[PDB]
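ugh ok so i messed up the first submission bc i forgot one of the chains. this is the corrected input, ALL of the components this time, i swear. 142 residues overall. if the numbers dont match what u have on ur side tell me asap before i send this to the collaborators (the ones from the other lab, u know who)
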Amino acid sequence: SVLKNTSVIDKIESYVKQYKPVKIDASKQLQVIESFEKHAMTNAKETESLVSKELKD
Amino acid sequence: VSTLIPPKVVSSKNIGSAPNAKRIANVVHFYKSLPQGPAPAIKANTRLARYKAKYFDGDNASGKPLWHFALGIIAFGYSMEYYFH
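and heres the new structure output, hopefully the right one now
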């Protein structure tokens, strides 16, 4: 309303509203992210099993 | 580019280090070692076992055996130097 010669704001306001759903998130990592973890379980438990055995040994 | 993972890689790293070479050495040096002076075999019984327990043991280790040897020559006075050359 500060502009008495508006003529574009409704177009611009609609332009914001038509692109109001800009873009979704990208949660694509659901197979490789845990593959880093599957190596993480493998090596950590390999280490933990060894150190637990060796500390008593 | 990602989270690096060298916190847990000792399962194959505990082979090349120098202390591991000493580790595998002295543990074998320990298990069979006799605990508290066991199996010393202090009861020696072989021919002159009495000698093995008085002077031949080594607790005294003095000139007594040669004194015994000298006295044996003295007791053989009329066997080697007398009645013979």
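quick check: Helices of chain B lie at 18-26, 49-54, 64-75, 77-81. that seems consistent at least. The CA atoms of residues 44 and 52 of chain B lie 7 Å apart.
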